[PDB]
Short mmCIF file of C-alpha atoms and ligand atoms in Angstrom, two decimals:
data_model
loop_
_atom_site.label_atom_id
_atom_site.label_comp_id
_atom_site.label_asym_id
_atom_site.label_seq_id
_atom_site.Cartn_x
_atom_site.Cartn_y
_atom_site.Cartn_z
CA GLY A 1 0.01 0.10 0.03
CA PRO A 2 1.04 3.85 0.89
CA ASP A 3 4.59 4.36 2.15
CA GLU A 4 3.87 5.24 6.02
CA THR A 5 7.52 6.56 7.24
CA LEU A 6 6.01 10.17 7.97
CA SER A 7 3.29 9.02 9.82
CA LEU A 8 5.46 6.81 12.18
CA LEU A 9 8.31 9.46 12.68
CA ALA A 10 4.88 11.95 13.66
CA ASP A 11 3.74 9.15 16.42
CA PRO A 12 6.81 6.94 16.82
CA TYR A 13 5.53 5.26 20.01
CA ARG A 14 2.32 4.89 19.55
CA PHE A 15 1.53 4.62 15.52
CA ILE A 16 1.71 1.02 16.29
CA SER A 17 -0.90 0.02 18.62
CA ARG A 18 -3.13 2.62 17.07
CA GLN A 19 -3.50 0.75 14.07
CA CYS A 20 -3.83 -2.41 15.96
CA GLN A 21 -6.59 -1.07 18.08
CA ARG A 22 -8.52 0.21 14.79
CA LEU A 23 -7.96 -3.27 12.99
CA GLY A 24 -8.50 -5.53 15.92
CA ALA A 25 -5.29 -7.29 15.52
CA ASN A 26 -2.30 -7.69 17.19
CA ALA A 27 -0.47 -7.49 13.84
CA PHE A 28 -0.05 -5.63 10.67
CA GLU A 29 1.82 -5.17 7.03
CA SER A 30 3.13 -2.03 6.49
CA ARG A 31 5.64 0.08 4.80
CA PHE A 32 8.61 2.29 6.16
CA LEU A 33 11.13 3.73 3.94
CA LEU A 34 10.40 1.69 0.97
CA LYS A 35 10.52 -1.64 2.65
CA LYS A 36 6.98 -3.95 3.16
CA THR A 37 7.03 -3.83 7.13
CA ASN A 38 5.20 -6.39 9.56
CA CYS A 39 4.63 -4.70 12.49
CA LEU A 40 3.62 -6.94 15.83
CA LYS A 41 2.63 -5.63 18.97
CA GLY A 42 1.81 -8.13 21.87
CA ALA A 43 3.40 -11.03 23.98
CA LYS A 44 2.85 -13.78 21.34
CA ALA A 45 4.33 -11.42 18.84
CA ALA A 46 7.12 -10.85 20.77
CA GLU A 47 7.84 -14.72 21.67
CA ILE A 48 8.03 -15.16 17.59
CA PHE A 49 10.04 -11.98 17.40
CA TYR A 50 13.14 -13.63 19.79
CA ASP A 51 12.95 -17.23 17.86
CA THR A 52 16.33 -16.98 16.51
CA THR A 53 15.32 -19.99 13.85
CA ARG A 54 13.08 -17.36 12.41
CA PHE A 55 14.53 -14.09 13.02
CA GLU A 56 17.87 -12.43 12.07
CA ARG A 57 19.89 -9.13 13.01
CA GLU A 58 22.13 -9.14 10.01
CA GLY A 59 21.82 -5.90 8.05
CA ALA A 60 18.33 -5.27 9.29
CA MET A 61 19.44 -2.15 10.99
CA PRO A 62 18.81 1.33 9.06
CA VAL A 63 22.38 2.89 8.27
CA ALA A 64 21.37 6.22 10.11
CA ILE A 65 20.97 4.65 13.54
CA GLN A 66 24.47 3.09 12.75
CA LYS A 67 25.90 6.48 12.12
CA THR A 68 24.53 7.83 15.33
CA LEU A 69 22.63 5.96 18.04
CA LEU A 70 24.44 2.44 17.40
CA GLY A 71 27.86 2.77 16.16
CA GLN A 72 29.21 -0.20 13.05
CA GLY A 73 30.36 -3.55 14.11
CA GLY A 74 28.84 -3.69 17.57
CA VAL A 75 26.54 -6.85 19.25
CA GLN A 76 23.35 -5.51 17.89
CA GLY A 77 24.29 -6.58 13.91
CA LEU A 78 25.11 -10.07 14.77
CA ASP A 79 23.46 -13.70 14.57
CA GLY A 80 24.04 -17.00 15.92
CA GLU A 81 27.12 -18.09 17.87
CA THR A 82 28.97 -15.08 16.66
CA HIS A 83 26.32 -13.30 18.28
CA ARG A 84 26.14 -15.22 21.59
CA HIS A 85 29.74 -15.22 22.27
CA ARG A 86 29.91 -11.62 21.71
CA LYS A 87 26.85 -11.04 24.22
CA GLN A 88 28.64 -13.01 26.83
CA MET A 89 31.32 -10.60 26.89
CA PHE A 90 28.48 -7.99 27.95
CA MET A 91 27.06 -10.65 30.18
CA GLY A 92 30.17 -10.98 32.45
CA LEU A 93 30.15 -7.33 33.28
CA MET A 94 27.23 -7.81 35.25
CA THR A 95 27.56 -9.37 38.31
CA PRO A 96 25.20 -8.00 41.52
CA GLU A 97 28.55 -6.77 42.83
CA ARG A 98 29.93 -5.11 39.82
CA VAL A 99 26.39 -3.87 39.28
CA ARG A 100 26.10 -2.39 43.06
CA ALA A 101 29.55 -1.06 42.56
CA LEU A 102 28.25 1.36 39.41
CA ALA A 103 25.12 2.26 41.65
CA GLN A 104 27.49 3.39 44.39
CA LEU A 105 29.34 5.21 42.52
CA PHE A 106 26.32 7.24 40.77
CA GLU A 107 25.00 7.99 44.09
CA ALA A 108 28.30 9.84 44.94
CA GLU A 109 28.56 11.57 41.49
CA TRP A 110 24.77 12.82 42.23
CA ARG A 111 25.55 14.25 45.77
CA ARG A 112 28.50 15.65 43.97
CA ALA A 113 26.59 17.42 41.50
CA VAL A 114 23.92 18.92 43.92
CA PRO A 115 25.59 22.10 45.27
CA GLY A 116 26.25 22.93 41.74
CA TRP A 117 22.81 22.51 40.95
CA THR A 118 21.90 24.57 44.34
CA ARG A 119 24.03 27.52 43.59
CA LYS A 120 21.97 27.43 39.95
CA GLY A 121 18.73 28.34 41.67
CA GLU A 122 16.95 26.47 38.69
CA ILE A 123 17.87 23.37 36.52
CA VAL A 124 16.00 21.39 33.82
CA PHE A 125 16.92 17.91 36.36
CA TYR A 126 17.29 16.02 32.49
CA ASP A 127 19.98 18.29 31.66
CA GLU A 128 21.93 17.74 34.48
CA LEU A 129 21.75 13.96 34.71
CA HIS A 130 24.26 13.19 32.02
CA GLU A 131 27.20 14.31 33.53
CA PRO A 132 27.07 12.66 36.80
CA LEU A 133 26.35 9.32 34.85
CA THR A 134 29.11 9.90 32.58
CA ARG A 135 31.45 10.28 35.57
CA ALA A 136 30.03 6.98 37.15
CA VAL A 137 29.79 4.70 34.19
CA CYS A 138 33.34 6.04 33.02
CA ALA A 139 34.84 5.18 36.44
CA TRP A 140 33.15 1.64 36.72
CA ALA A 141 34.18 1.03 32.96
CA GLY A 142 38.01 1.86 34.02
CA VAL A 143 37.88 4.63 31.31
CA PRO A 144 40.00 7.63 32.77
CA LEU A 145 38.19 10.80 32.45
CA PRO A 146 39.97 14.15 33.50
CA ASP A 147 37.65 16.67 35.77
CA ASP A 148 37.80 19.08 33.10
CA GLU A 149 36.40 16.87 30.13
CA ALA A 150 33.68 15.42 31.84
CA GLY A 151 31.34 17.84 31.03
CA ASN A 152 31.99 17.33 26.92
CA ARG A 153 31.99 13.77 27.22
CA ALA A 154 28.71 13.65 28.39
CA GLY A 155 27.42 16.14 26.03
CA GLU A 156 29.07 13.47 23.23
CA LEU A 157 27.55 10.64 24.62
CA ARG A 158 24.19 12.51 25.01
CA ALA A 159 24.13 13.80 21.67
CA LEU A 160 24.27 10.35 20.35
CA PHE A 161 20.70 9.44 21.35
CA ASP A 162 19.12 13.00 22.08
CA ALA A 163 20.21 14.66 18.63
CA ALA A 164 19.32 11.15 16.89
CA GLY A 165 16.04 10.33 14.89
CA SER A 166 15.56 14.19 14.64
CA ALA A 167 13.97 16.14 11.90
CA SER A 168 16.22 18.81 12.34
CA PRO A 169 20.34 19.58 11.95
CA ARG A 170 20.53 18.01 14.79
CA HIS A 171 21.30 14.71 12.94
CA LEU A 172 24.73 16.37 11.76
CA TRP A 173 25.89 16.76 15.49
CA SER A 174 24.86 13.43 16.35
CA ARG A 175 27.35 11.75 13.57
CA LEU A 176 29.91 14.05 14.42
CA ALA A 177 29.67 13.20 17.91
CA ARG A 178 29.78 9.27 16.94
CA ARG A 179 33.07 9.93 15.06
CA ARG A 180 34.51 11.76 18.16
CA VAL A 181 32.82 9.18 20.72
CA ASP A 182 34.34 6.23 18.40
CA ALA A 183 38.01 8.01 18.45
CA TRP A 184 37.90 8.63 21.85
CA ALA A 185 36.93 5.00 23.13
CA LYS A 186 39.35 3.53 20.20
CA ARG A 187 42.26 5.43 22.52
CA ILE A 188 40.93 3.84 25.44
CA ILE A 189 41.46 0.64 23.84
CA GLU A 190 44.59 1.23 22.13
CA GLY A 191 46.10 2.61 25.82
CA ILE A 192 45.11 -0.48 27.47
CA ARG A 193 46.60 -2.93 24.59
CA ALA A 194 49.86 -1.04 24.77
CA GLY A 195 50.14 -0.75 28.50
CA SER A 196 49.57 2.92 28.64
CA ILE A 197 46.00 2.66 30.53
CA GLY A 198 45.78 0.70 33.62
CA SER A 199 42.21 -0.31 33.85
CA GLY A 200 41.43 -2.98 36.50
CA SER A 201 40.74 -6.54 35.24
CA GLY A 202 37.38 -6.32 36.15
CA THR A 203 36.23 -3.29 34.34
CA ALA A 204 34.18 -3.01 30.95
CA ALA A 205 36.83 -1.26 29.31
CA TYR A 206 39.35 -4.02 29.87
CA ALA A 207 37.13 -7.25 29.29
CA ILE A 208 36.57 -5.22 25.87
CA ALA A 209 40.24 -4.52 25.27
CA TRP A 210 41.40 -8.35 25.92
CA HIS A 211 38.07 -10.10 24.67
CA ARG A 212 39.00 -12.83 22.11
CA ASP A 213 36.49 -13.79 19.15
CA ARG A 214 35.82 -17.32 18.30
CA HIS A 215 38.88 -17.33 16.57
CA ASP A 216 40.72 -16.50 19.43
CA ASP A 217 41.66 -12.54 17.93
CA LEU A 218 41.37 -9.55 19.38
CA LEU A 219 38.67 -7.20 18.61
CA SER A 220 39.71 -4.77 15.83
CA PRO A 221 40.49 -1.58 17.57
CA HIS A 222 37.24 0.31 16.42
CA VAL A 223 34.89 -2.56 17.31
CA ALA A 224 36.10 -2.55 20.38
CA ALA A 225 35.68 0.94 20.74
CA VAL A 226 32.05 0.45 19.41
CA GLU A 227 31.07 -2.25 22.16
CA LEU A 228 32.66 0.19 24.68
CA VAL A 229 30.53 3.06 23.41
CA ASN A 230 27.89 0.32 23.93
CA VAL A 231 28.06 0.34 27.63
CA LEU A 232 29.06 3.96 28.01
CA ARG A 233 25.92 5.69 26.08
CA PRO A 234 22.86 3.34 27.33
CA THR A 235 23.91 4.15 30.57
CA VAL A 236 23.99 8.22 30.51
CA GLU A 237 20.58 7.45 28.31
CA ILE A 238 19.27 6.39 32.18
CA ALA A 239 18.93 9.97 32.47
CA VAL A 240 15.47 9.64 30.84
CA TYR A 241 14.26 6.86 33.18
CA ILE A 242 15.77 9.45 36.01
CA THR A 243 13.58 12.03 34.59
CA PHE A 244 10.19 9.82 34.41
CA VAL A 245 10.75 8.96 38.04
CA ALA A 246 10.86 12.53 39.06
CA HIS A 247 7.76 12.91 36.70
CA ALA A 248 5.67 9.87 38.52
CA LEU A 249 6.53 11.33 41.82
CA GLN A 250 4.85 14.55 40.95
CA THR A 251 2.02 13.20 38.78
CA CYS A 252 0.43 10.23 40.63
CA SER A 253 -0.68 10.74 43.90
CA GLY A 254 0.17 8.13 46.84
CA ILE A 255 3.77 7.47 45.14
CA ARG A 256 5.84 9.62 47.08
CA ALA A 257 4.62 8.40 50.52
CA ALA A 258 4.34 4.57 49.48
CA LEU A 259 8.09 5.00 48.28
CA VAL A 260 8.91 6.55 51.91
CA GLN A 261 7.50 3.91 53.96
CA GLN A 262 7.54 0.56 52.32
CA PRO A 263 11.08 -0.98 51.57
CA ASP A 264 9.46 -3.27 48.88
CA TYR A 265 7.72 -0.77 47.12
CA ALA A 266 11.05 0.51 44.99
CA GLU A 267 11.29 -2.39 43.07
CA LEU A 268 7.53 -2.51 42.05
CA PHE A 269 7.72 1.24 41.32
CA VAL A 270 10.91 1.08 39.04
CA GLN A 271 9.49 -1.64 37.18
CA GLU A 272 6.13 0.37 36.74
CA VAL A 273 8.43 3.32 35.49
CA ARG A 274 10.07 0.90 32.83
CA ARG A 275 6.36 -0.56 31.64
CA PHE A 276 4.14 2.59 31.99
CA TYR A 277 6.78 5.48 30.37
CA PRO A 278 7.95 5.25 26.65
CA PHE A 279 11.45 5.14 26.12
CA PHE A 280 13.01 2.65 22.97
CA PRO A 281 9.76 2.62 20.77
CA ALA A 282 10.40 -0.84 18.88
CA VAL A 283 13.15 -3.17 17.51
CA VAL A 284 13.77 -4.51 14.12
CA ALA A 285 14.64 -7.75 12.45
CA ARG A 286 14.30 -9.61 9.35
CA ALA A 287 12.82 -12.82 8.86
CA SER A 288 15.21 -15.77 8.20
CA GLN A 289 12.74 -18.03 6.42
CA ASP A 290 9.35 -18.59 4.97
CA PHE A 291 6.83 -18.84 7.45
CA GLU A 292 3.16 -18.12 8.18
CA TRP A 293 1.94 -16.95 11.97
CA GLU A 294 -1.82 -15.95 12.84
CA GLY A 295 -2.66 -15.67 9.29
CA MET A 296 -0.10 -13.50 8.22
CA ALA A 297 2.58 -14.06 5.68
CA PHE A 298 6.08 -13.83 6.58
CA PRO A 299 8.49 -14.52 3.57
CA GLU A 300 12.40 -14.68 3.86
CA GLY A 301 13.56 -10.99 4.04
CA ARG A 302 10.49 -9.13 5.19
CA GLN A 303 11.70 -6.66 7.68
CA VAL A 304 9.33 -6.78 10.86
CA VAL A 305 9.14 -4.29 13.94
CA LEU A 306 7.85 -5.36 17.24
CA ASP A 307 6.32 -2.48 19.32
CA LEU A 308 7.58 -2.60 22.86
CA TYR A 309 5.56 0.40 23.93
CA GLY A 310 2.40 -1.08 22.69
CA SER A 311 3.03 -4.74 24.04
CA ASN A 312 3.92 -2.81 27.38
CA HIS A 313 0.32 -1.22 27.06
CA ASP A 314 -1.39 -4.56 25.78
CA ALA A 315 -4.62 -5.09 27.50
CA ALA A 316 -4.45 -8.95 27.58
CA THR A 317 -1.37 -8.59 29.46
CA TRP A 318 -2.37 -6.03 32.06
CA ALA A 319 -5.83 -5.72 32.02
CA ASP A 320 -5.60 -1.77 32.66
CA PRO A 321 -2.15 -0.80 31.10
CA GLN A 322 -3.40 2.96 31.11
CA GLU A 323 -3.25 3.52 34.70
CA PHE A 324 0.22 3.76 36.38
CA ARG A 325 0.41 1.40 39.08
CA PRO A 326 3.39 -0.31 40.68
CA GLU A 327 1.46 -3.06 42.75
CA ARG A 328 0.31 -4.57 39.17
CA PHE A 329 4.04 -6.18 39.56
CA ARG A 330 3.07 -8.12 42.88
CA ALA A 331 0.92 -10.57 40.51
CA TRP A 332 3.51 -10.72 37.83
CA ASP A 333 4.82 -13.63 36.49
CA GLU A 334 8.21 -12.89 35.70
CA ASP A 335 7.34 -13.72 31.88
CA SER A 336 9.95 -13.09 29.37
CA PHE A 337 8.26 -12.11 26.74
CA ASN A 338 4.90 -10.32 28.18
CA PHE A 339 6.91 -7.21 29.74
CA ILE A 340 9.88 -5.75 27.38
CA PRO A 341 10.68 -2.20 27.49
CA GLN A 342 14.25 -3.06 27.32
CA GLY A 343 13.85 -6.31 24.90
CA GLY A 344 12.23 -9.73 25.58
CA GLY A 345 13.65 -13.17 25.35
CA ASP A 346 16.88 -14.60 26.84
CA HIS A 347 19.76 -12.62 27.60
CA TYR A 348 22.52 -14.93 26.36
CA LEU A 349 20.41 -16.54 23.82
CA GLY A 350 19.08 -13.17 22.08
CA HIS A 351 19.18 -9.50 21.75
CA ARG A 352 17.76 -8.54 25.06
CA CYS A 353 19.37 -5.77 26.90
CA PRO A 354 22.14 -6.42 28.97
CA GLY A 355 21.82 -3.34 30.67
CA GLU A 356 18.46 -4.16 32.99
CA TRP A 357 20.16 -4.58 35.97
CA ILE A 358 22.11 -1.44 35.77
CA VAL A 359 19.02 0.29 34.85
CA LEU A 360 17.45 -1.33 37.93
CA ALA A 361 19.88 -0.60 40.36
CA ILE A 362 20.12 3.28 38.87
CA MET A 363 16.45 3.92 38.76
CA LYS A 364 16.33 2.80 42.75
CA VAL A 365 19.36 4.91 43.83
CA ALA A 366 17.22 7.92 41.78
CA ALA A 367 13.77 7.02 43.45
CA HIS A 368 15.68 6.55 47.08
CA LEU A 369 17.59 10.23 46.96
CA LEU A 370 14.79 12.14 45.36
CA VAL A 371 12.43 11.05 48.29
CA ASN A 372 14.80 10.43 51.18
CA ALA A 373 17.23 13.19 50.51
CA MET A 374 16.99 15.50 47.95
CA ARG A 375 14.61 18.43 48.64
CA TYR A 376 13.25 20.63 45.62
CA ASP A 377 10.30 22.70 44.53
CA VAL A 378 8.23 22.04 41.06
CA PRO A 379 7.29 25.58 39.45
CA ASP A 380 4.15 25.42 37.14
CA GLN A 381 5.49 23.74 33.78
CA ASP A 382 4.56 21.33 31.11
CA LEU A 383 5.11 17.92 32.51
CA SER A 384 2.74 16.56 29.59
CA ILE A 385 5.01 13.61 27.93
CA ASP A 386 6.21 14.53 24.62
CA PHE A 387 5.36 11.60 22.25
CA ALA A 388 6.25 12.97 19.24
CA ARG A 389 9.94 13.49 20.73
CA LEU A 390 13.01 10.76 20.46
CA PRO A 391 13.30 9.98 23.12
CA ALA A 392 10.04 11.08 24.81
CA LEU A 393 9.94 13.51 27.47
CA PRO A 394 8.14 15.75 29.69
CA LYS A 395 8.35 18.83 27.56
CA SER A 396 9.80 20.68 30.40
CA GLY A 397 12.39 18.10 30.98
CA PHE A 398 11.20 18.52 34.39
CA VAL A 399 12.23 21.93 35.84
CA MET A 400 13.39 22.25 39.52
CA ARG A 401 13.91 25.20 41.91
CA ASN A 402 15.89 25.44 44.95
CA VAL A 403 17.29 22.35 45.01
CA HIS A 404 19.20 21.18 48.27
CA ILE A 405 20.43 17.56 50.25
CA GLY A 406 21.16 16.24 53.12
CA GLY A 407 22.92 12.77 53.45
C1 HEM B 501 18.73 3.45 29.52
C2 HEM B 501 17.50 2.31 29.46
C3 HEM B 501 17.71 1.41 28.48
C4 HEM B 501 16.87 1.03 27.51
C5 HEM B 501 15.17 1.57 27.48
C6 HEM B 501 17.26 -0.08 26.94
C7 HEM B 501 16.74 -0.70 25.63
C8 HEM B 501 17.19 -1.85 24.93
C9 HEM B 501 16.46 -2.60 24.04
C10 HEM B 501 15.14 -2.36 23.55
C11 HEM B 501 17.61 -3.03 23.40
C12 HEM B 501 17.09 -3.99 22.02
C13 HEM B 501 16.73 -5.43 22.44
C14 HEM B 501 16.57 -6.21 20.83
O1 HEM B 501 17.30 -5.94 19.95
O2 HEM B 501 15.66 -7.18 20.84
C15 HEM B 501 18.55 -2.96 24.25
C16 HEM B 501 19.86 -3.80 23.68
C17 HEM B 501 21.05 -3.29 24.26
N1 HEM B 501 21.42 -2.66 25.33
FE1 HEM B 501 19.78 -1.36 26.24
N2 HEM B 501 18.42 -0.26 27.10
C18 HEM B 501 18.85 0.50 28.47
C19 HEM B 501 20.18 0.67 29.06
C20 HEM B 501 21.15 -0.18 28.81
C21 HEM B 501 22.33 0.05 29.70
C22 HEM B 501 22.63 0.60 30.95
C23 HEM B 501 23.30 -0.64 29.05
C24 HEM B 501 24.89 -0.95 29.78
C25 HEM B 501 25.66 -2.40 29.24
C26 HEM B 501 22.74 -1.53 27.52
C27 HEM B 501 23.45 -2.04 26.37
C28 HEM B 501 22.80 -2.78 25.70
C29 HEM B 501 23.58 -3.50 24.66
C30 HEM B 501 25.07 -3.86 24.71
C31 HEM B 501 22.49 -3.66 23.81
C32 HEM B 501 22.39 -4.78 22.35
C33 HEM B 501 22.61 -6.49 23.03
C34 HEM B 501 22.22 -6.96 21.73
O3 HEM B 501 22.04 -6.95 20.32
O4 HEM B 501 22.33 -8.40 22.31
N3 HEM B 501 21.47 -1.27 27.92
N4 HEM B 501 18.61 -2.06 24.77
#
């Protein structure tokens, strides 16, 4: 039929679920760029999407994303045993103690940045999160980061996802940010291999610099650089989820008090933040063989997009997805396909986000400080979510006035 690209960019989070609702189905055939695209939504859809005998990621990623968001040669573009062996490198980083260490470093950096925020009077909370995250994740990952460069590197990491997918000249800064960050990370890898950088044996940058592939070869310095940015960048992106934590504390009644007094509530709350709020709209794969599913044809080579936001707001799964209610997670069966803000399926055997433990730990630190430590006022502003923005944010970016902290 018609090309629907422009309609998708106008409503990137909701386009799929809205059409699904219109059609009374969990899937529909469409066309993005010029490719026929099957669009899927829901737990059953997610589960077939993560079947690696039917779906491949190889070459499925639009080049614009490679040259900004993702880089070229990274784990996202791999399939099969090549993929599994590369994904294992990421998974080995995420021990409960290593995740804890990153959370601890991030709390310290948050606390160090508050005085700065106090003397400012008024801050855009979102704008202020990138640098502490950058400082935290760099130290955790063994990436040296001098004090006077921290601001700039945070700006560059931010530019990879917050200027990327944009209708404006911001796409140009994003592409240059990618070349700068790639060259920086590459210099890090090279110094580790040459002995000039003493990154500890438990650190991401070390693991990535010394990773051997299935042929016992080091990654090429550029591919290693891209994989290191795949740790640094998405950690800084947690700024979005932290902003949504502040937003929930502000727009939904009872949340604050429940968090203060109920110990087990934090975990339910951060889960519901990830379910409720838009972040990553969709993931893309290519059908690897001819098959049919619930009446829909999936010929070899068909581009297929899995709607994450729609799946997270699926009525069959949640009954009242439209409500923000952390308690729903008391009844969650931990299914790997019905709740997928960072992908579904298995972490080792598919492309599901290895960053979930980090996101959760950091979201918890955020929720803890925002209720138990950090005091602030919230002036009249537009807190409505910008569903036409990538990534989606409250329009204001969540503005704070009179910020101060204890311990
Ligand atoms: C900030 C919130 C985050 C969101 C919303 C998010 C979401 C996602 C999604 C939707 C995917 C694709 C899953 C798929 O292709 O099936 C993914 C993959 C990935 N994520 Fe995240 N993530 C986040 C944080 C992180 C963090 C902190 C890390 C740190 C290591 C990380 C590292 C990665 C990597 C390396 C991949 C590719 C994995 C693969 O292809 O096997 N992410 N993420």
